[PDB]
Amino acid sequence: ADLEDNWETLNDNLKVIEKADNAAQVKDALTKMRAAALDAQKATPPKLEDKSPDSPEMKDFRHGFDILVGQIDDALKLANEGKVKEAQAAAEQLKTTRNAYIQKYL
């Protein structure tokens, strides 16, 4: 599994969350999103294989996943309280972070 697989894992589990009926299902999918975000954060995106590991672009990339993981944790907290609809709405906003921070490097 590489960075592209991790990106598609995020997409598949966002669909799981969208279609979920209860908080347990949302928690499972958020778990897989968090795992894939951690794996992707350690990868070097194609457009940045050029750059040095501490370039402003690579810091952008890794920090986009720090923000994403923190937002996944916020959604997990909602799901852990039984707030299914709140957690699903939070998951929708994970696409805003994913698209704005990370997409420009794939």
Author numbering: 1 to 106
Which passages does the manuscript contain on this structure?
Previous studies showed that proper introduction of disulfide bonds could stabilize the flexible region of target proteins and reduce the conformational entropy by locking the protein into single desired conformation. The theoretical and experimental results both indicated that with relatively lower values of conformational entropy, proteins would be more stable and readily crystallized to higher diffraction resolution.
Eventually, four pairs of BRIL mutants and three pairs of Flavodoxin mutants, together with their WT proteins, were crystallized and structure determined. Compared to WT BRIL, three mutants (T9C-A36C, V16C-A29C, and K27C-A79C) show relatively better or similar diffraction resolution, lower conformational entropy (ΔS) and comparable B-factor. For BRIL proteins, the simulation B-factors are consistent with the experimental values. Based on our algorithm, the best-engineered constructs of BRIL and Flavodoxin show lower entropy and higher diffraction quality than the wild type proteins, and the predicted disulfide bond on GLP-1R facilitated crystallization of the GLP-1R transmembrane domain.
